Amino acid sequence: MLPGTFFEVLKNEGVVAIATQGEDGPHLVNTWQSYLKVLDGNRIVVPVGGMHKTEANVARDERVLMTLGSRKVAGRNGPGTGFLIRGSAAFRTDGPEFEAIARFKWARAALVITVVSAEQTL
Amino acid sequence: MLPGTFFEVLKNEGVVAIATQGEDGPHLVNTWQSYLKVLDGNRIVVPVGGMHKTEANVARDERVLMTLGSRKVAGRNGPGTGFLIRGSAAFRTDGPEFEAIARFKWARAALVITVVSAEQTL
Ligand SMILES: Cc1cc2nc3c(=O)[nH]c(=O)nc-3n(C[C@H](O)[C@H](O)[C@H](O)COP(=O)(O)O)c2cc1C
Ligand SMILES: Cc1cc2nc3c(=O)[nH]c(=O)nc-3n(C[C@H](O)[C@H](O)[C@H](O)COP(=O)(O)O)c2cc1C
Ligand SMILES: [Cl-]
């Protein structure tokens, strides 16, 4: 379901934001869009170093939001675009999904987001 | 509240992410770094075109989270840094906080975030 424009965004560096439901409000953490590994079956894989609070939140409510964008990819009405992604999250520590981010020596886990929707919001 | 490194990040373009508490989970929207207008007294102003869901969320829970970063500013252990900002949000349609972003003619309002903490997370 992830569109070509999203893959264009990934050719450019930028900050990714990942929102989870915490016990007293949202939580918000980051990765780099160059770190993202996209696998078939609508999966976005993020290398996890910290994200201990994020992981605890995901254990309670698997639903996450992710945003990312680039000034270098045209939106609907000018230069620059980005996406709101909604999906379900899981944390893997062995197997192919963990192996996907094993280029990152500092990683303790792989955050696997299975995308339910992707909305180009600009 | 806001450190020099945060202002260094603002010399560069990038996507800002703003999380609010929604009725059934977090909400997450964006602006551009170049749009942020920082005022005296720890205020970050964002031009608002849409943000209707975000505004409804803020009306019920004023606490928001904001992240942003840049690969072009040194973090603690290598190139690239960013911030988690926590603050209270209000929407203005007039007065000096609105006038701060009124140059954006598509702006129906100003989102004013009064910063309570700023954490460099990389
Ligand atoms: C630009 C940027 C990129 C980051 N990349 C990662 C990352 O790839 N993996 C990670 O675990 N934390 C990364 N961090 C730190 C996380 O945003 C977060 O602060 C940390 O993992 C703690 O997560 P938690 O608050 O859920 O415990 C990055 C921070 C910034 C500002
Ligand atoms: C990179 C990027 C920058 C954006 N800049 C703004 C902005 O400055 N102001 C704004 O109201 N919406 C901006 N948008 C759209 C918002 O993220 C959001 O989708 C829209 O305001 C609707 O908000 P809501 O879901 O709270 O109703 C931007 C989107 C992207 C991807
Ligand atoms: Cl960008």
UniProtKB/Swiss-Prot annotation, chains A, B:
<dbReference type="InterPro" id="IPR012349">
    <property type="entry name" value="Split_barrel_FMN-bd"/>
</dbReference>
<keyword id="KW-0813">Transport</keyword>
<dbReference type="GO" id="GO:0005737">
    <property type="term" value="C:cytoplasm"/>
</dbReference>
<keyword id="KW-0288">FMN</keyword>
<keyword id="KW-0249">Electron transport</keyword>
<dbReference type="InterPro" id="IPR011576">
    <property type="entry name" value="Pyridox_Oxase_N"/>
</dbReference>
<dbReference type="Pfam" id="PF01243">
    <property type="entry name" value="PNPOx_N"/>
</dbReference>
<comment type="subunit">
    <text>Monomer and homodimer.</text>
</comment>
<keyword id="KW-0963">Cytoplasm</keyword>
<protein>
    <recommendedName>
        <fullName>FMN-binding protein</fullName>
    </recommendedName>
</protein>
<keyword id="KW-0285">Flavoprotein</keyword>
<comment type="function">
    <text>Functions as a redox protein with a potential of -325 mV.</text>
</comment>
